[PDB]
Amino acid sequence: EALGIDDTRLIVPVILIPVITFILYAGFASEQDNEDFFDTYDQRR
Amino acid sequence: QAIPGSEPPPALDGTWVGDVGFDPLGFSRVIDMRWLREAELKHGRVCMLAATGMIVQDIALFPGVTKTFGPAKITALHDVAVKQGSMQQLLVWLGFLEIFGFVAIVQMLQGSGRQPGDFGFDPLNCGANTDTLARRQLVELKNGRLAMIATGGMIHHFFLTGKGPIEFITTL
Amino acid sequence: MFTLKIVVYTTVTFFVSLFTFGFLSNDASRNPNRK
Amino acid sequence: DRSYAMPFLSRPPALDGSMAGDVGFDPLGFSNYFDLKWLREAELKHGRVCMLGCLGFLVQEQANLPLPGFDNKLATEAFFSVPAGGLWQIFFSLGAIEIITNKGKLTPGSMFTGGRAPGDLDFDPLNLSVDETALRRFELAELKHARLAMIGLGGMLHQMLLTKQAPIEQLTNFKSLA
Amino acid sequence: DFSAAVPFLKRPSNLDGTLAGDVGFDPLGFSDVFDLRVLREAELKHGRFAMLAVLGFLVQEVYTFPFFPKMAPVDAHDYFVTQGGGSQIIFWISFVEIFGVVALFELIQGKRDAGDFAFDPLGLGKDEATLARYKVAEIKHARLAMIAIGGFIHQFWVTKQTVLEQLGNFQSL
Amino acid sequence: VFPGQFSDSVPFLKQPTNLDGSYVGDVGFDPLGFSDVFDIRV
Amino acid sequence: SASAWERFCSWITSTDNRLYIGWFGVLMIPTLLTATTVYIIAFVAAPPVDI
Amino acid sequence: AAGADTAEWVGVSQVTEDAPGIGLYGKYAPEYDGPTFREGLEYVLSFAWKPPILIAW
Amino acid sequence: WGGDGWIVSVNNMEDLVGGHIWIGIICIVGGFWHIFTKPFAWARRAYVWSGE
Ligand SMILES: CC1=C(C#C/C(C)=C/C=C/C(C)=C/C=C/C=C(C)/C=C/C=C(\C)C#CC2=C(C)C[C@@H](O)CC2(C)C)C(C)(C)C[C@H](O)C1
Ligand SMILES: CC1=C(C#C/C(C)=C/C=C/C(C)=C/C=C/C=C(C)/C=C/C=C(C)/C=C/C2=C(C)CCCC2(C)C)C(C)(C)C[C@H](O)C1
Ligand SMILES: CC1=CCCC(C)(C)[C@H]1/C=C/C(C)=C/C=C/C(C)=C/C=C/C=C(C)/C=C/C=C(C)/C=C/C1=C(C)CCCC1(C)C
After folding, report:
1. How far is D110 from chain A, CA to nearest CA, in Å?
2. Cβ–Cβ contacts within 10 Å for residue B34, how many?
3. How far apart are CA B66 and CA B70, in angstroms?
4. Strand, helix or coil at E5?
5. Pocket around ligand 1: residues whose beta carbon is below 6 Å from it?
6. Cβ within 8 Å of residue E168, ≥6 positions away
7. How would DSSP label each residue in chain H?
8. Residues E104 and E38: beta-carbon distance below 8 Å
9. With contact defined as beta carbons under 8 Å apart, do I32 and C12 qualify?
10. Which of A3, D27, E64, E109 is most buried, judged by most C-beta within 10 A?
11. Which residues of chain A neighbour I42 with C-beta distances below 8 Å?
């Protein structure tokens, strides 16, 4: 049983919720600069 | 001038075959004139051939066709010939021709220079000169409309009575 | 028992998704020495 | 200043007539409170999904792939008959398509910030709609087909849910409700 | 300035006489308080419903569709409560009057005439004199049918027989 | 039948844009315009 | 001006909250509250267990 | 090499320009500068909790 | 958990060898992937790029 899933209705939230969170995160990331930097971390937000 | 009370659409301003100003609903206001005239000639020619073929079918059949198709005409003939593959062959080859007809319509609408219904099919140079060509255009359009109404009449007569054209008009 | 299971799966997925996409959101920049 | 679709209602302020498919049909005033680019993008996406969906509804019953679990003319039951792993693979592939074709701009506040027409996903392999008037005619045709396909997909799905019969088969075997 | 219809009552201050059927009849004075445009909208819609209902009663008594069972119009209401056709009818009425709400809001804002949905598909009324005459006839028929539909329903309730059936044998009780 | 320039093979279709006639076997037969979308050499 | 997710991340990682939440707190707070609730109720009134 | 970029490869349609629904420009993409998405959701909610119905009477 | 054991419960050598084939294929494909690519923008924002 993959991910403890025995009913196919359980897959709907497990896949769906990360999609919506990724949509919000993708709006955030599209707001960003997204070019390469030479440093230990990116100070641009 | 067809209907004295009303007026023709501004697309109907002469310079077209059969233009008697008859378009009360206003199809030419929203549809291009070339597409309309091409469709009119296509429907007219299809109905001309259909009516003549139906008359011939109710008069005399081909040798050996009654053994397979039986005593079936019009709609039963179609229902048997779709299973036989005759209508399938007709569909394939006529759609193959309509591919070239389609690109002809496209080139007409984008401005190649051809007129609606002009496929260049003039064997024996019949009616290719002077005012005879325009008279043949008018005759073709009027006879196409007449054959359209007649084809509808034949189909609905077989729907109502179950008899062919030449036997319905003699057995009222 | 299935309704409770799907509610729990939805809640766990929601909070784990928030965690995962929050630490992906340039967490190293969120320090007082930035800029 | 009455709308063309609703002669008894005034024309919506955001529906001037420059956008394609506009006959002034916004009775509830969605364009006054939502981005019209977002609304048109959603309308076109729904309509394209529904056009392909109606095509699938008509095709699946007459022809199906020769695969186990792929023999079900009723598409609603075919959703549960096809293995779910392939359905989720379809879901993730379409999600990747959505990611790529929007350049990672998915929220309403970021989708049109880079500059993009609503529904313009850069898909014209035949290089059509270079002509502006042809572009307008094709846009009107696309919108009319989108709305018609949304309505048709809804109707066919509801009829398949109720009568348990696939389309055109339902037309040839018309069984009225009890 | 007394009322033209009621000679002992003053003419209501909001009934100038420009509306169709405005004869000055308003004893209780609902036009003094509530908006006249909304009241005319309600009057016209009540009347249109009642006219369709009276014509429907006549037709249903004289002819029922062969795929529907044969019965009286009034007790068919419960049959279509159970069957589901009445739910469809009120569903589509609600769908039309969802936009009716927007039309009423525009009427409140003053950008629409009362009862004017611009529904003239056959082009019967285009001349202004004919339009005014048709407005007067429409409001008179609306009032007459508003009375008549209640008459039909109550006569069926007391006599247990339909309209033309009661006109057949006039039983008095 | 009507005056105008058309293809040698099909008389109701014009000569295609990229079928100039330099290549052999070219009777001007390209109704769907495959030569307009892709290169004539390929 | 910022996106909704950016404002959510600014609130989660905010130093102005009385108790700091953070992304680890996103996982921590509901888990610890669930454990606390179940522990309190099971310590007060839970039937005997066949250990 | 081809591109169909010659000035004859244009789309065709039977519909004239005078038919309703045809816009003025090809791809307009209007500038919004209006109420936010949250305010739009609040408006859709006000469809439910304050419809313009009893304001008539 | 008990009765399932995740990947500790491999109970035959066929699964072991087949999944080692899978691991080798995945590792080689990913190695060429990392030889020929540079980290994406989300990975560049996510991680700290230092030896420690
Ligand atoms: C864009 C683009 C391209 C392209 C493309 C493509 C792929 C274009 C595809 C377009 C498609 C597939 C359009 C499909 C529309 C379907 C509709 C409207 C269905 C309506 C259903 C109805 C009315 C119904 C119904 C019914 C109901 C509800 C009840 C039933 O009892 C009865 C019934 C069945 C009648 C190409 C490739 C050319 C290149 C170009 O450069 C760019
Ligand atoms: C509930 C229910 C149903 C129902 C129902 C329905 C729809 C019931 C409807 C009942 C209605 C519409 C009654 C209307 C009565 C009107 C009257 C008395 C007007 C009198 C006017 C006068 C006297 C005018 C007087 C006058 C005035 C003022 C002005 C001029 C002078 C004069 C002419 C004298 C069903 C059928 C659906 C079934 C369901 O299971 C149960
Ligand atoms: C089947 C079996 C029997 C016995 C032998 C055999 C080898 C065959 C065995 C197994 C075969 C196979 C195919 C094994 C595959 C194992 C795999 C895919 C292991 C991968 C584990 C992935 C892990 C930890 C991911 C860790 C990354 C995390 C958390 C997140 C990092 C970050 C992101 C992306 C989100 C926010 C937080 C942070 C830190 C910025």
Report:
1. 6
2. 18
3. 5
4. coil
5. D 51-52, 54-55, 123-126, 128, 145, 148-149, 152, 155-156, 159, 167, 170-171
6. none
7. --TT-STT-----SB-TTSTB--SSSS---------HHHHHHHHHHHHHS-TTTT--
8. yes
9. no
10. D27
11. 29
Amino acid identity, position B77: L
Put simply, the answer to whether A34 touches I50 (Cβ < 8 Å) is no
Q: Quote the minimal CA–CA distance from H1 to chain F in Å.
A: 6
CB D156 within 8 A of CB D60: no
State the distance from the centre of ligand 2 to the C-alpha of E145, rounded, in angstroms. Answer: 10
| Share of chain I residues as helix, strand and coil, in percent rounded to the nearest 5 | 65, 0, 35
Element (H, E) at E71: none
Q: How many residues in total does chain C contain?
A: 35
Q: Which residue of G has its CA nearest to A45?
A: G6
Question: Please, is D130 exposed, middle or buried when counting C-beta atoms within 10 Å of its C-beta (0-12, 13-18, 19+)?
Answer: middle
Contact D169/D61 with Cβ under 8 angstroms?
yes
Residue type, F8: D
CB atoms near residue H4 (< 10 Å) = 20
Which tokens go with D143? 């919108």
- Which chain E residues are Cβ-neighbours of H56 within 8 angstroms? 35, 38, 104-105, 107-108
Question: Between B75-84 and B130-161, two packed helices, what is the crossing angle to 10 degrees?
Answer: 100
* φ and ψ of I32, to 5 deg: -65, -35
Contact indicator for D82, D69 with CB cutoff of 8 Å: yes
How many CA within 13 A on the CB side of residue E96? 7
Q: Which atom of ligand 3 is nearest to the CA of I26?
A: 13
Q: Return d(Cα H24, Cα H17) in angstroms, integer.
A: 10
Q: How far is CA B145 from CA B17, B117, G47, in A?
A: 13, 14, 92
Q: If interface means Cβ-Cβ distance under 8 Å, which residues of chain A face chain I?
A: 1, 29, 32, 34-37, 39-42
**Pairwise CA distance, residues B147 & B52, whole Å:** 9
Q: Given the structure tokens 């509901």, which residue do they identify?
A: G30
Amino acid at F32: L
Tokens 């009777």, located at residue: F27
Q: From E21, E23, E19, select the one nearest E114 (Cα to Cα).
A: E19
DSSP element (H, E) containing C25: none
For residue E46, which phi and psi values (nearest 5 degrees)?
Answer: -55, -45
> Is there a contact between C35 and A42 if contact means CB atoms under 8 Å apart?
no
Which chain B residue lies closest to H21 (C-alpha atoms)? B30
Phi-psi region of C24 (alpha: psi -120 to 50; beta: other; left: phi over 0): alpha
Provide the 10 A C-beta neighbour count for residue B123. 5
CB atoms within 10 A of CB I6: 7
Backbone angles phi, psi at D5, to 5 degrees: -70, -40
Measure Cα distances from D80 to A17, D49, D84, E5 in Å: 22, 20, 7, 72
Indicate the resolution in Å: 2.5
Alpha-carbon gap, residue B161 to B155, rounded angstroms: 10
* Conformation bin of residue F4: beta by default, left when phi > 0, alpha when psi is -120 to 50: left
Question: Nearest C-alpha to atom 39 of ligand 3 is from which residue?
Answer: C23
Of G28, G23, G27, residue with least CA distance to G12: G23
* Closest ligand 2 atom number to CA of residue E74: 36
Here the tokens at position H40 are: 């739009």
